[PDB]
Amino acid sequence: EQQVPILEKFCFTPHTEEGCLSERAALQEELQLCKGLVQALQTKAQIPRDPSQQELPRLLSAACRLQLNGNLQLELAQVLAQERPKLPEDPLLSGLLDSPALKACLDTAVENMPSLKMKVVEVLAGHGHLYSRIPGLLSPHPLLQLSYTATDRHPQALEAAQAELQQHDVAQGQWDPADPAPSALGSADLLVCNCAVAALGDPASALSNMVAALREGGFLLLHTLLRGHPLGDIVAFLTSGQGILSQDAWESLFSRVSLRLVGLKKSFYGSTLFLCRRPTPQDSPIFLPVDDTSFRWVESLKGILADEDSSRPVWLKAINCATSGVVGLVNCLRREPGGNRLRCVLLSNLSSTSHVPEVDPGSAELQKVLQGDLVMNVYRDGAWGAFRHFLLEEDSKTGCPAHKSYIIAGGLGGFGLELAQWLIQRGVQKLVLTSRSGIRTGYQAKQVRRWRRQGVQVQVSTSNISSLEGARGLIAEAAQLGPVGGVFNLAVVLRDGLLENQTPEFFQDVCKPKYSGTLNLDRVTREACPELDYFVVFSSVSCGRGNAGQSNYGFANSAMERICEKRRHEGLPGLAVQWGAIGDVGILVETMSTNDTIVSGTLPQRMASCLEVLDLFLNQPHMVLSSFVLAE
Ligand SMILES: NC(=O)C1=CN([C@@H]2O[C@H](COP(=O)(O)OP(=O)(O)OC[C@H]3O[C@@H](n4cnc5c(N)ncnc54)[C@H](OP(=O)(O)O)[C@@H]3O)[C@@H](O)[C@H]2O)C=CC1
Ligand SMILES: Cn1ncc2cc(-c3ccc(C4=NC5(CC5)C(=O)N4C[C@@H]4CCN(C(=O)C5CC5)C4)cc3)ccc21
Ligand SMILES: [Cl-]
């Protein structure tokens, strides 16, 4: 019966995060217990619910048992070797793998792929078990194809997992990281290794051979435990394995093998996800500002990317506009010809208090960004990072007071009429629907006639929000009916086409109702709408994910999202909703059809689902949300 959409929040995510998982009391308690069981040792049942029933506490207690009589010094080899393959499921030894930290690293890798494909190799999968996590974490990507190979030194180490491996199209191989990689595993896009449990052996040699297996620009994801931290020291004590190094040692090792560090997730107890990258021979970068409002820079970019012969990296710089939509622009152009040449920098501070770093050609900061060579480089309030998607949690209902006015920009549109209907039946008695040319269809006129016959005061306005004057006039109209309780920007103009077929004027057209419109709506509601409860813009997966031939559209949407973020930061209402394909009504169904037409591995979301999801979203504290329905 009902569709089940995937719901996510779109958050700015620092490259470096520390103290992670500190809010997980179940982990805090378990860590305390383990700390006790080692201080005891040195000095001398249903699903595990209490922190003492977990794998590592169990092992430690069994080592106290031996410590009493049978002697751990003699039996440790058989107990450790016994419970070894089960230890990676300990909550602490896999906290980061279970957290969104893993997803954040994987998505960073995917984002920096030149195409929607990734060749993956897992080292020491027999105890790493990352093959049972990564494919599932990336399966929501409707287009991404993975080529995954699980490898290990001892061919039998992956025997008990032959079923799941083969059944989920994961290839198997033999590789001791001590040696060089089989040539077949070469030119890998991503090498992963969970050596929190797995015997890494000599890490210097191991890392050297891993890098060699990566392509230039390829990524290494390493999960491990740090010396000088509690969990690392505890696991080390049980070792009497080798491969448990301090962070300084790790970073020295990365330098020694040329690995560039570009990501770092550290838990409060010292478990760590290193995201490293093999360098690409730095060709002289090109630097193009995109802050020019005339979008003249579009013509410049046309010329640059027209040069098919060149491999010059193209860096788009947005340093004088926090509400730039460069991120959305890039997500689209990356899917267009020469898109792999693209990177970007975006200075987007939410606080005017915050310091702006200098990223002119020749700065330490800019050179540091270049060495990383990441596609997405967003500076925000003291931290470098990028917007990432994360699984929204579960969570009341939406009712509107009869005396408040509600505005829908683009209200006579497909989604707009359905939104008006939904708002009404949630109590709305005062509606203002805007349109550049007023009513134009019998369908539109009919719904308005109905709503009026029901008693709903429905005004149809032509006050163009793309202008500050027209905007100001619009809220005046709504005010004449009652205090503006909410605004909903559903206005859109399309000027699709590859960038080679784009113009600055087309970009201006597309940005008029979305970018300029939402700016003016932000300004006037701040001034004259003190009872505004809702400030909702409708964005798209075209912005949040990217879509060839819609770069201007991605830009406009992305800019709206930035505005919403600033608004929420200042306590004002604000919400961008990245919609996937929408069935029943709207532009898409006009070309064409509701159900049947699979759209890039996703399905048009039925309006029933859409409104149900919108209800959930309107009652969230998050700035940017996403909804789409996966096909198959
Ligand atoms: N349809 C889909 O599948 C998806 C849609 N979205 C977003 O959802 C929203 C609505 O989608 P949808 O119903 O399909 O599109 P529609 O084209 O059906 O309706 C939106 C309307 O905006 C009006 N409009 C354009 N410019 C202005 C302006 N300056 N002031 C006032 N009205 C204006 C247009 O009509 P007119 O020219 O007469 O003024 C059009 O009727 C948009 O923001 C779109 O980007 C996102 C993802 C998927
Ligand atoms: C989790 N995840 N990861 C990656 C990813 C990518 C997408 C995704 C889906 C669809 C498209 C897409 N394809 C076409 C050409 C047919 C197309 O038109 N689109 C854009 C959709 C369908 C219509 N859309 C609009 O915004 C219309 C202009 C109003 C959105 C683009 C990307 C979704 C989720 C994703
Ligand atoms: Cl790239």
Measured from the Cβ of residue 1, the count of other Cβ atoms closer than 10 Å reads 2
542 lines ligand 2 (CB under 6 A): yes
Ligand nearest to the CA of 372: 3
Mutation choice for ligand 1 from 432, 435, 437, 595, CB with most ligand atoms inside 8 A: 435
Beginning with the edge strand found earlier in the chain, give each strand of the sheet holding 171-174 in spatial order.
16-20, 260-267, 271-277, 214-225, 188-194, 117-122, 145-152, 171-174
Ligand nearest to the CA of 113: 3
Classify 440 as helix, strand or coil: coil
Tell me how far the alpha carbon of residue 87 lies from the centroid of ligand 3, in angstroms.
Answer: 37
Q: In this structure, what are the phi and psi dihedrals at residue 543, rounded to the nearest 5 degrees?
A: -80, -55
Instruction: Determine contact, residues 92/268, Cβ cutoff 8 Å.
Output: no
502 lines ligand 2 (CB under 6 A): no
306 lines ligand 2 (CB under 6 A): no
541 lines ligand 2 (CB under 6 A): yes
Ligand nearest to the CA of 626: 2
Q: Ligand 1 — pocket residues by CB below 6 A?
A: 409-410, 412-416, 434-437, 464-466, 490-493, 512-513, 517, 538, 540, 579, 581-582, 586-588
- Residue 163 and residue 159: Cα distance in Å, rounded? 9
Residues 6+ apart with CB under 8 A from 584: 414, 418, 594, 604, 606, 607
Between the alpha carbon of residue 397 and those of residues 619, 620, 625, the distances in Å are 7, 11, 17
Tell me how far the alpha carbon of residue 218 lies from the centroid of ligand 3, in angstroms.
Answer: 9
Type and span of the H or E element at 178: none
224 lines ligand 2 (CB under 6 A): no
540 lines ligand 2 (CB under 6 A): yes
Does 130 carry a binding-site annotation?
no
Mutation choice for ligand 1 from 587, 590, 598, CB with most ligand atoms inside 8 A: 587
Does 563 carry a binding-site annotation?
no
Q: What length does the chain have?
A: 632
The candidate with the shortest Cα–Cα distance to 557, out of 514, 588, 507, 520, is 514
- Residue 127 and residue 150: Cα distance in Å, rounded? 11
Cα angle for residues 151, 155, 157 (degrees, 5° grid):
80
Does 419 carry a binding-site annotation?
yes
Ligand nearest to the CA of 590: 1
Does 486 carry a binding-site annotation?
no
Does 420 carry a binding-site annotation?
yes
Q: Which residue minimizes the CA distance to atom 41 of ligand 1?
A: 413
Instruction: Determine contact, residues 188/214, Cβ cutoff 8 Å.
Output: yes
Residues 6+ apart with CB under 8 A from 367: none
The sign of the torsion formed by the CA atoms of 140, 141, 145, 149 equals: negative
Does 328 carry a binding-site annotation?
no
545 lines ligand 2 (CB under 6 A): yes
- Residue 168 and residue 159: Cα distance in Å, rounded? 15
Tell me how far the alpha carbon of residue 304 lies from the centroid of ligand 3, in angstroms.
Answer: 16
- Residue 567 and residue 466: Cα distance in Å, rounded? 19
Q: Return the ligand 2 atom nearest residue 599 CA.
A: 16
Does 482 carry a binding-site annotation?
no
Residues 6+ apart with CB under 8 A from 631: 142, 598, 601, 602, 603
Residue with the two structure tokens 């640059």: 304
Mutation choice for ligand 2 from 8, 106, 542, CB with most ligand atoms inside 8 A: 542
Burial (Cβ within 10 Å: 0-12, 13-18, ≥19) of residue 457: middle
Instruction: Determine contact, residues 625/536, Cβ cutoff 8 Å.
Output: no
- Helices 468-481 and 517-528: crossing angle in degrees, nearest 10, is 50
- Residue 381 and residue 156: Cα distance in Å, rounded? 50
Residues 6+ apart with CB under 8 A from 438: 412, 460, 462
Does 407 carry a binding-site annotation?
yes
DSSP-assigned letters across all residues of 93-128: TTHHHHSHHHHHHHHHHHHT-SSSEEEEEESSHHHH
Does 405 carry a binding-site annotation?
yes
Tell me how far the alpha carbon of residue 616 lies from the centroid of ligand 1, in angstroms.
Answer: 22
- Residue 63 and residue 71: Cα distance in Å, rounded? 8
Classify residue 284 as left (phi > 0), alpha (psi -120 to 50) or beta. beta
Tell me how far the alpha carbon of residue 421 lies from the centroid of ligand 1, in angstroms.
Answer: 16
Resolution of the coordinates, Å: 2.3
Tell me how far the alpha carbon of residue 420 lies from the centroid of ligand 1, in angstroms.
Answer: 14
Instruction: Determine contact, residues 408/433, Cβ cutoff 8 Å.
Output: yes
552 lines ligand 2 (CB under 6 A): no
Domains of the chain: 1-279 (no CATH), 280-393+399-632 (3.40.50.720)
Burial 337-362 (b: 16+ CB within 10 A, else e): ebbbbbbbbbbbbbeeebeebebeee
Burial (Cβ within 10 Å: 0-12, 13-18, ≥19) of residue 549: middle
Tell me how far the alpha carbon of residue 186 lies from the centroid of ligand 1, in angstroms.
Answer: 47
Does 565 carry a binding-site annotation?
no
Q: Which tokens sit at 155? A: 């061919």
588 lines ligand 2 (CB under 6 A): yes
600 lines ligand 2 (CB under 6 A): yes
Cα angle for residues 151, 156, 159 (degrees, 5° grid):
90
Ligand nearest to the CA of 536: 1
Ligand nearest to the CA of 558: 1
- Residue 573 and residue 565: Cα distance in Å, rounded? 10
The candidate with the shortest Cα–Cα distance to 275, out of 98, 99, 94, 107, is 107
| Residues pairing with 221 in the sheet | 192, 275
The candidate with the shortest Cα–Cα distance to 208, out of 152, 259, 245, is 259
137 lines ligand 2 (CB under 6 A): no
Burial 244-263 (b: 16+ CB within 10 A, else e): bbebeebbebbeebebbbbb
Looking at this protein, which amino acid is placed at residue 616?
Answer: L
Q: Return the ligand 1 atom nearest residue 587 CA.
A: 14
Q: Which residue minimizes the CA distance to atom 21 of ligand 1?
A: 410
- Residue 470 and residue 201: Cα distance in Å, rounded? 69
Q: Which residue minimizes the CA distance to atom 24 of ligand 2?
A: 581
Q: Which residue minimizes the CA distance to atom 28 of ligand 1?
A: 513
Ligand nearest to the CA of 343: 3
Measured from the Cβ of residue 381, the count of other Cβ atoms closer than 10 Å reads 14
Q: ω before 592 within 30° of 0 (cis)? A: yes
Q: In this structure, what are the phi and psi dihedrals at residue 304, rounded to the nearest 5 degrees?
A: -55, -55
* Radius of gyration over every alpha carbon of the chain, rounded to an integer in angstroms: 27
Cα angle for residues 84, 88, 89 (degrees, 5° grid):
115
Tell me how far the alpha carbon of residue 583 lies from the centroid of ligand 2, in angstroms.
Answer: 13
Measured from the Cβ of residue 28, the count of other Cβ atoms closer than 10 Å reads 15
Residue with the two structure tokens 């995060």: 17
Looking at this protein, which amino acid is placed at residue 468?
Answer: L
3-class SS letters over 331-355: HHHCCCCCHHHEEEEEECCCCCCCC
- Residue 534 and residue 617: Cα distance in Å, rounded? 11
